[PDB]
Design a protein around this ligand. Sequence first.
Ligand SMILES: O=C(O)C(=O)/C=C/[C@@H](F)C(=O)c1ccccc1F
Ligand SMILES: O=C(O)C(=O)/C=C/[C@@H](F)C(=O)c1ccccc1F
Ligand code: NA
Ligand code: NA
Lengths: 276, 276
Amino acid sequence: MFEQFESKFIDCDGIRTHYIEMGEGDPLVLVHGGGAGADGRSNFADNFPIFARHMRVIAYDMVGFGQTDAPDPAGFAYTQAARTDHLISFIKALGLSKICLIGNAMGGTTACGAALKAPELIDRLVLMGAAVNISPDDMVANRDDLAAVMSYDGSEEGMRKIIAALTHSYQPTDDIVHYRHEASLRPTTTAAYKATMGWAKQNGLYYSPEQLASLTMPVLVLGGKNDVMVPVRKVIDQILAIPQAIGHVFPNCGHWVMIEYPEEFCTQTLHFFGKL
Amino acid sequence: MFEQFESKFIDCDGIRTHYIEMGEGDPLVLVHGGGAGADGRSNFADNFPIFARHMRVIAYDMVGFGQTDAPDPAGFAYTQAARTDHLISFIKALGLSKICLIGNAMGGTTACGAALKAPELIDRLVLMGAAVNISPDDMVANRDDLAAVMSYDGSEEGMRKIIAALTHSYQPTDDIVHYRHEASLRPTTTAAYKATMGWAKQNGLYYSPEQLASLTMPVLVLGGKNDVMVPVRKVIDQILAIPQAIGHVFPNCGHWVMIEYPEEFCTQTLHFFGKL
Ligand SMILES: O=C(O)C(=O)/C=C/[C@@H](F)C(=O)c1ccccc1F
Ligand SMILES: O=C(O)C(=O)/C=C/[C@@H](F)C(=O)c1ccccc1F
Ligand code: NA
Ligand code: NA
């Protein structure tokens, strides 16, 4: 699946990193979520052609996901810092500067991490249902709704349950479910995933109010009102914690704004990027 | 001032009502705020030409304001119900149906009132810094920041203070200040204004969470993050209280989104109206 895009690979400080790209013009990097079996292609396949009409759009796979290396967790710590450094390494490896950057959930954590740590690489930032203020205590309190993703049972029904959790009223195709299930079944990513999620569960996915206020570039914060992974009040706290942030909230919409309301997602981000 | 627009007048159940209009196509009615000297022309003069390119745009003056009748408060109660009924009467008098409707502050109260009471007239509703959940207690607690408007001293500096309160970083022209000061000085509107504001102060500008959830048509809720009259957390409560509502929050922006970020205000509303 997704063979309409040419898989490319590049070395990021020894992590061999998969990505796709389309279009031309200024760079836009998209960072996928951390649910089981997720990657750039599957997260952003519908948005890619819209974005490609205006920008050079790039989706990569995070360390531990997709077709990027998933180093053995016997010797590799799957921490948020590892993701953030991977993203930074990716951006430099492609020779990119002043990028537009969108991150979904754990991808939002990672996009926000890079914006904080390597601001000189990023002109504009979009956080979409970004896990940037989910503390360990929040992981405990929201445990029931987070279970589908964070303690994924490895099965096919489990993958349908993940997708029904991430969305308000979306029926995925049998093909998307199969694609993600198959991806999730591979031993190396099953292992990297348990490490990723075990860390997240005890350290949360979190920056402090002061860190969030320290962002130096324009920010757009997006959220589905019905999101159960990063609830709307957490997205609202992000809008208020980041002084320069624009906030947009989508009704009748779960975590996956970009799949549930693809056209609306691209219009708002493209508008914010100065392209419409 | 504002003579680029032809003043028109129409009778609304015995209240002679001033309005302007421009463009053609589907109707869009704009409802101004309730600050001293405000009216349709002065509130929406910059937005009018943008909107006119796509719709038939109409701004009227609320009972007690502008060049609409300001019936003697010895015999007229300046209640929110009176405003809401005036708006409904206006919409029917022009022979309009399925309108788009935008209300600012007390105009938001009035737009929301009409949407609740005469939903069959209104297809889409925009609340911009709308006073739709400001209780009497809220009037007391936010009294210091509300003083410029609600206990306006009648002077010219007072009018500059009103405008500096409504905005984050806006210098109005001497002409706009003069226009509003002059308007505010007339005895009949000075009197209607004190009645309007005295009522508001003790009854608030308020619908209940259940009333807000009862809206039957699409809603877009807008707010400036720095608004001091209807603070952003009150606008956020509106987004959450109204299930179908889209929320948009503007950074570096006071109460007057439509004057501070005119192009951005029209793009978001026009997009929501299905015109872009
Ligand atoms: O799997 C996806 O495509 C996706 O976007 C899921 C997001 C998500 F579940 C993830 O990033 C996450 C992990 C732990 C806690 C909260 C999350 F929101
Ligand atoms: O005067 C204006 O142009 C305007 O938009 C002001 C809004 C406003 F002050 C008003 O509607 C109001 C009255 C009482 C309490 C809060 C308000 F927000
Ligand atoms: Na669901
Ligand atoms: Na100000």
